[PDB]
């Protein structure tokens, strides 16, 4: 590969193609369907080092995971705000008039 004959260049591609689209989901205010996104490419990460004989592999799985699981707990979390939040400044409920 680049500067070293080793990598584990499968499992985390495959991964990374997920990761867009709970970002793209994010942007869309559509949280829950990114919160699940990460769930997936997580369960995927850690089966894929209970697969690999190597270290090193292993490795650049222990890492990838950290922040496919940072982003679910940011999400989560940003998601119940708004649940509350969203419903007050958006216009809905009893009026005046």
Same mark, same amino acid.
């Given at each position: 590969?680049?500067?070293?004959?080793?990598?584990?260049?499968?499992? /985390?591609?495959?991964?990374?193609?997920?990761? *867009?689209?709970?970002?793209?989901?994010?942007?869309?205010?559509?949280?829950?369907?990114?919160i699940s996104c990460h769930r997936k490419a997580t369960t995927y990460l850690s089966e894929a080092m209970k697969?690999?004989?190597?270290?090193?592999?292993?490795?650049?799985?222990?890492?990838? *995971?950290?922040?496919?699981?940072?982003?679910? /707990?940011?999400?989560?979390? *940003?998601?119940? *705000?708004?649940?509350?939040?969203?419903?007050?400044?958006?216009?809905?409920?009893?009026?005046?008039?």
């Amino acid at each position: 590969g680049s500067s070293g004959s080793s990598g584990m260049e499968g499992p /985390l591609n495959l991964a990374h193609q997920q990761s *867009r689209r709970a970002d793209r989901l994010l942007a869309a205010g559509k949280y829950e369907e990114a919160i699940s996104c990460h769930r997936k490419a997580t369960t995927y990460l850690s089966e894929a080092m209970k697969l690999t004989e190597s270290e090193q592999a292993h490795l650049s799985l222990e890492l990838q *995971r950290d922040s496919h699981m940072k982003q679910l /707990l940011l999400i989560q979390e *940003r998601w119940k *705000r708004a649940k509350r939040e969203e419903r007050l400044k958006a216009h809905s409920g009893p009026s005046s008039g």
